[PDB]
């Protein structure tokens, strides 16, 4: 029903494609895209910004979601909200996703319409060792495009 799309865009080579589909009236929302641009290797994940107070895309929290509290991942915490760890590129960049939030939903107590999709211009290296900046992104969280999923037809 709810088909959201969302057409990476910032750095500039960071074209990814992601589209939020949700063809259920009890079923999950099938996120899955492709980015463009990155490189094979690993890069933050979604959902990630330090402060702002100005707006550039969204507003509504920039601190991530209390859902996940922390990156979460191999010491799970809680990463109940689209804040997992970080991803991995194919052969040249081009990241693609698949999962199925039913928790979620794209409007309501846990409306997801607003997921400045971005990615990270770095490698948190699956951890830098560290804390207070792995922890909670990649050590180096810099954000550049902005796939936000909003509705379309």
Same mark, same amino acid.
């Given at each position: 029903?709810? %088909?959201?799309?969302?057409?990476?865009?910032?750095?500039?080579?960071?074209? !990814?494609?992601?589209?939020?589909?949700?063809?259920?009236?009890?079923?999950?929302?099938?996120?899955?895209?492709?980015? %463009?641009?990155?490189?094979?290797?690993?890069?933050?994940?979604?959902?990630?910004?330090?402060?702002?107070?100005?707006?550039?895309?969204?507003?509504?929290?920039?601190?991530?979601?209390?859902?996940?509290?922390?990156?979460?991942?191999?010491?799970?915490?809680?990463?109940?909200?689209?804040?997992? !760890?970080?991803?991995?590129?194919?052969?040249? !960049?081009?990241?693609?996703?698949?999962?199925?939030?039913?928790?979620?939903?794209?409007?309501?107590?846990?409306?997801?319409?607003?997921?400045?999709?971005?990615?990270?211009? %770095?490698?948190?290296?699956?951890? %830098?060792?560290?804390?207070?900046?792995?922890?909670?992104?990649?050590?180096?969280?810099?954000?550049?495009?902005?796939?936000?999923?909003?509705?379309?037809?």
């Amino acid at each position: 029903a709810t %088909k959201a799309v969302a057409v990476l865009k910032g750095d500039g080579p960071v074209q !990814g494609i992601i589209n939020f589909e949700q063809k259920e009236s009890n079923g999950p929302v099938k996120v899955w895209g492709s980015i %463009k641009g990155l490189t094979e290797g690993l890069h933050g994940f979604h959902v990630h910004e330090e402060e702002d107070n100005t707006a550039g895309c969204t507003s509504a929290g920039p601190h991530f979601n209390p859902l996940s509290r922390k990156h979460g991942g191999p010491k799970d915490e809680e990463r109940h909200v689209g804040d997992l !760890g970080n991803v991995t590129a194919d052969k040249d !960049g081009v990241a693609d996703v698949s999962i199925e939030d039913s928790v979620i939903s794209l409007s309501g107590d846990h409306s997801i319409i607003g997921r400045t999709l971005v990615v990270h211009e %770095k490698a948190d290296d699956l951890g %830098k060792g560290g804390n207070e900046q792995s922890t909670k992104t990649g050590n180096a969280g810099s954000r550049l495009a902005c796939g936000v999923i909003g509705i379309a037809q």
